[PDB]
Write a protein that binds this ligand. Structure first.
Ligand SMILES: Nc1nc2c(ncn2[C@@H]2O[C@H](COP(=O)(O)OP(=O)(O)OP(=O)(O)O)[C@@H](O)[C@H]2O)c(=O)[nH]1
Ligand SMILES: [Mg+2]
Length: 167
């Protein structure tokens, strides 16, 4: 299988994204993550291979960082999620990626997820240009999503799946 972790500050929607990827309904059973939670899903990649995604959904709360840190190692893909209205959550992305890289040398693809795009654009606290510029400087990709819109979750996992299939 392919180890994928979701990291990012508390409340950005990591668990909502994972539940949407796993289940085809409205999401409703979500509380803050403490210990990392595991799920697996087998998917057909564009090259026709079946890939098993081994997914760990980790805690964003600051007091639980010493749990989340124990899940970095041996990750092949990472989704780093932030909330477009939560400026601190965006500033935190740099440090999430920095910390992952201190602890893990195996990641092949880091995808920054700008989440909660359903919120009115005039309430966003980060611009598309800032997001693109950040990623251009930090050897990572970006995508825009809303946990409540399955089309955006299918898309962001599709990008991750395509990259895993290149390994
Ligand atoms: N408007 C909006 N709210 C969202 C979206 N995704 C998640 N939320 C809400 O944000 C809150 C936090 O979502 P979670 O999925 O628990 O966030 P998390 O990143 O897993 O948080 P931690 O486990 O504490 O790190 C919930 O009330 C969600 O319903 C989204 O795309 N748009
Ligand atoms: Mg969570």
């Amino acid at each position: 299988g392919y180890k994928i972790i979701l990291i990012g500050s508390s409340g950005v929607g990591k668990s909502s994204i994972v539940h949407q990827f796993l289940f085809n309904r409205k999401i409703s059973n979500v509380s803050p993550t403490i210990g990392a939670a595991f799920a697996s899903k087998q998917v057909i990649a564009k090259n026709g291979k079946t890939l098993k995604l081994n997914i760990w959904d980790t805690a964003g709360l600051e007091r639980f960082r010493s749990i989340t840190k124990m899940y970095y190692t041996n990750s092949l893909g990472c989704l780093v999620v932030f909330d477009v209205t939560d400026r601190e959550s965006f500033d935190d992305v740099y440090y999430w990626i920095n910390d992952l890289r201190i602890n893990c040398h195996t990641t092949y693809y880091i995808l920054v997820v700008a989440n909660k795009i359903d919120i009115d654009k005039n309430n966003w606290r980060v611009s598309e240009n800032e997001i693109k510029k950040f990623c251009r400087d930090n050897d990572c990709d970006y995508v825009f999503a809303s946990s409540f819109e399955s089309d955006t979750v299918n898309n962001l996992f599709g990008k991750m799946i395509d990259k895993m299939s290149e390994i």
